[PDB]
Amino acid sequence: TRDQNGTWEMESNENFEGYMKALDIDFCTRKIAVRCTQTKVIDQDGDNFKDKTTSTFRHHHNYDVDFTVGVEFDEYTKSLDNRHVKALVTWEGDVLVCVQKGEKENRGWKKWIEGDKLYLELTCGDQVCRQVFKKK
Amino acid sequence: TRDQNGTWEMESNENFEGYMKALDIDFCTRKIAVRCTQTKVIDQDGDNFKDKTTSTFRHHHNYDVDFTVGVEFDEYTKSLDNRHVKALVTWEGDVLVCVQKGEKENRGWKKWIEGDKLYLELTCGDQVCRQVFKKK
């Protein structure tokens, strides 16, 4: 049949990456594109076609870590760089301090409550990242 | 206080990029990561901690094409390789065939209905991508 009308959702995709490589599309764009869902809405009247394609990309991470203050533990940083570190969490006053011994120097974090907000500082090398959290 | 229990929503995030760079996380991953919402659930029993961090990002784009079988039209392949092609669609039996005339050789696609599924094969050079769609 020549009637292609419908709302069409992709259920299988094969060699999308090879096709995109042949288009000289960069590795980054290919990595995102291949993870997209696709919906095609085809509105066809005879030989007249209106094709509306929607591409969706979703990213979702859960990262669970359990530890006891003062007991060195093994950490696998799966929601970041996916490296093995040996982490030691201690208290310095009211600040929770973690050193992550491993490949990177100066790697760790500090976490404390101030003014009913949670403060986190992550360090790696000469880089410090500062994050602030609100109670939901 | 040393009580860090709570469901915490991130409201400020500064020098995340420099930190991820120091961890050798690539630009492709960083552009996704800086746009994720972050929720940290801290369940703390004395010096025993369970930290659950959730991070989520959603994005979509659209790609619309209108054409008539047998009428050549200009197509700009936005969200693919961003080139101008001269597209000519014809029927070969019940198979809809497009040639995208332009810089890439052997560039085109074929689209047909079989059973109740839509089949698409996109070609560029010697690379063929095959996609299958079900009616939703």
Swiss-Prot record, chains A, B:
Gene Ontology, cellular component aspect: cytosol; nucleus
Family matches, as InterPro entries: Calycin (IPR012674), Fatty_acid-bd (IPR000463), ILBP (IPR031259), Lipocln_cytosolic_FA-bd_dom (IPR000566)
Location of the protein in the cell: Cytoplasm
Amino-acid positions noted as binding all-trans-retinol in the UniProt annotation, renumbered to this chain: 40, 111
Any Gene Ontology biological process: fatty acid transport
GO function terms (MF aspect): fatty acid binding; molecular carrier activity; retinal binding; retinoid binding; retinol binding
Main location: cytoplasm
Gene3D superfamilies assigned: 2.40.128.20
CDD domains for the chain: CRBP2
Annotated function: Intracellular transport of retinol.
Protein name: Retinol-binding protein 2
Organism encoding this protein: Homo sapiens (Human)
Gene (UniProt): RBP2
